[PDB]
Amino acid sequence: PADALPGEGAVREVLRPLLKQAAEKTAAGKIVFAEAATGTGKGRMIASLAAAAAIKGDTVVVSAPLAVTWQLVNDMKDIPEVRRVGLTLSLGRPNFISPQRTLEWAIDNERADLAAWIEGGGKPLSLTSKVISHELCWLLEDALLLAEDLPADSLLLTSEDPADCPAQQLYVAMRSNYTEAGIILCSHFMLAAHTRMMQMRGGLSLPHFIDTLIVDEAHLLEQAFASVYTHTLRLRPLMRTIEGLGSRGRKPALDALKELFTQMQVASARSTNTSLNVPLSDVPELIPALKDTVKTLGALPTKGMSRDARSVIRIATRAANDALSGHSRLRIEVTPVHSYPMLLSGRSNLQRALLGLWNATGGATLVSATLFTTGDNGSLTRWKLEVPTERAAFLPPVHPAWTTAPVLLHKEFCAHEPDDSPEWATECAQTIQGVASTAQGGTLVLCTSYQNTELLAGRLGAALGDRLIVQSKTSSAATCLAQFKAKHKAGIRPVWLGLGAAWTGIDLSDHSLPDNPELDRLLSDLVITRIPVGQNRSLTHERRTAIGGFRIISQEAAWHFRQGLGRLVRRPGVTHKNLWVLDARIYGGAAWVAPFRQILDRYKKA
């Protein structure tokens, strides 16, 4: 209550010592790893840290996704020092998508939910924000919640987009309200795009040196960086756009694109393997094609092209050049198995970019509920974010008793090992049907693939009917979340066969009871069908496993698993929470299942 940080009285009691340690280690120039349980009030802690740093005179940047950005703004504006120093939102173009190209892609890939969201105006899905300029639509994060495999490289809002575009107009209207404030709030994608732009030089305007950086939900940061260095070449819309231009240079570009298509099919059939990402040296059939594809793309004149063709051809050239850089790993999707022709080029190492970020950062604090793999072991996270080992500071985690006290772990499990077989599907569906018959509220059932989900759906559909919500490629995660909330509100007890984002991001606390968490029954039964092994399909995870062995696989599996468990208790004061783990390998007496058996032992069984 004296000689304290701004807004520290609003920070919950449990996070105050962690707050003090983070403040100290950050002012000393260290990259702090502060893991705190969800529902403890991490937003107030972030607000107090940013306020203490901004009062000192530092340039403070808080990088957080837009979902939590609203509540972060609310928690920061409550601090008077923050309101005095100023708080702005650096909403650069990489935050927004192009409605035209996103709608076209959704149509070409038969993603009805994404098409409907674009047609409806791209309105915010989760979010509210009323005193920060206008309403934020066309957000990349919502689009990703509607299509996890969104080729964001080729669907982002560019400066070459027409002025009458809604996303462009929203960006310009937001940029007009941008002032030089003490605290700048950005997204993970904004921070990563800014770092990449700053490196490629040696509207995007972040401080060239971040005195104090505060990353919230830091377990997403790397993925953001990974997305910013991904390049996508979508051949069908590019070919269509070129078909809609003057014939002076149309024929050569179209013939070069068809040559590239044929060479991509050749390389695809050259070695099927298992969706393997190969360098350009392993598929030389694309080297001339790609080269030709670039030349013709620059040959046709801009005197006659609209802004749409301009941005499309520029993005295509950037992608084809990043493919021919040799520093990338390629993934081909063509006629044999993918109706939508596409060439992906990613970076299996983000070390230079993240090091450029940390070199331009005086001090930093990373906040999340899943920073450590076990205890305070942030080694996997440090490696992912490429934090210099001398600057990393693994503070103790904060996970109170209420995060597991209302939870009762059940002894029942599916005896047949998860082998993607119809027999496993039958047994696991019998188990899920039992859990659904006993369940008092909404039931979430996490799966590891679309195939397991389809089998479990074919079983549980005839049994449940009104209650079942099957996630798929067409049925996004957001539409399933909305169906879940609606069916729970109607009195039905829904059973959501979820995957993907259902493991990592969704907030299943009933917002109809913000002051009475004792009556929260929105998610009463969490069910884990499989240990999430092999769910990370990033190039950096491929390199990390190739270097460190099966320990990286096991640590990523435990990280994903603890995230999935973190969907059940989202706040204190809840009750009647049930946890189910059906993977027979847990109770199999193996060696690699020892980490998981730790967390599950931490609960109380019944």
Residue numbers in the entry: 104 to 230, 235 to 309, 323 to 726
Study text:
To better understand the function of the accessory domains we determined the crystal structure of CasDinG from P. aeruginosa strain 83 at 2.95 Å resolution with an Rwork/Rfree of (18.5 / 21.5) in space group P 65. We solved the structure by molecular replacement using an AlphaFold2 model of N-terminally truncated CasDinG. The CasDinG structure reveals a SF2 helicase core of two RecA-like helicase domains (HD1 and HD2) and two accessory domains inserted within HD1 (vFe/S and arch domain). An N-terminal domain of 103 amino acids was not observed in the electron density. The alignment revealed that the HD domains of CasDinG are in a wider, or ‘extra open’, conformation than the HD domains of the binary E. coli DinG structure. The extra open conformation may be a crystallographic artifact, or the result of having no ssDNA bound in the CasDinG structure. The first insert (residues 195–275) consists of a four alpha-helix bundle that aligns with the E. coli DinG FeS cluster domain with an RMSD of 2.3 Å using the Coot Secondary Structure Matching tool. Despite this conserved topology, CasDinG lacks three of the four cysteines observed in E. coli DinG that coordinate the FeS cluster, and no FeS cluster is observed in the electron density of the CasDinG structure. In CasDinG, the lack of a stabilizing FeS cluster is compensated for by a salt bridge formed between residues R204 and D269. Notably, analysis of CasDinG crystal packing suggests that the vFeS position that sterically blocks ssDNA binding is likely a crystallographic artifact, indicating a conformational rearrangement of the domain that allows for ssDNA would likely be allowed in solution.
CRISPR-associated DinG protein (CasDinG) is essential to type IV-A CRISPR function. Here, we demonstrate that CasDinG from Pseudomonas aeruginosa strain 83 is an ATP-dependent 5′-3′ DNA translocase that unwinds double-stranded (ds)DNA and RNA/DNA hybrids. The crystal structure of CasDinG reveals a superfamily 2 helicase core of two RecA-like domains with three accessory domains (N-terminal, arch, and vestigial FeS). CasDinG is an essential component of the type IV-A CRISPR Cas system, which clears bacteria of invasive nucleic acid and silences gene expression.
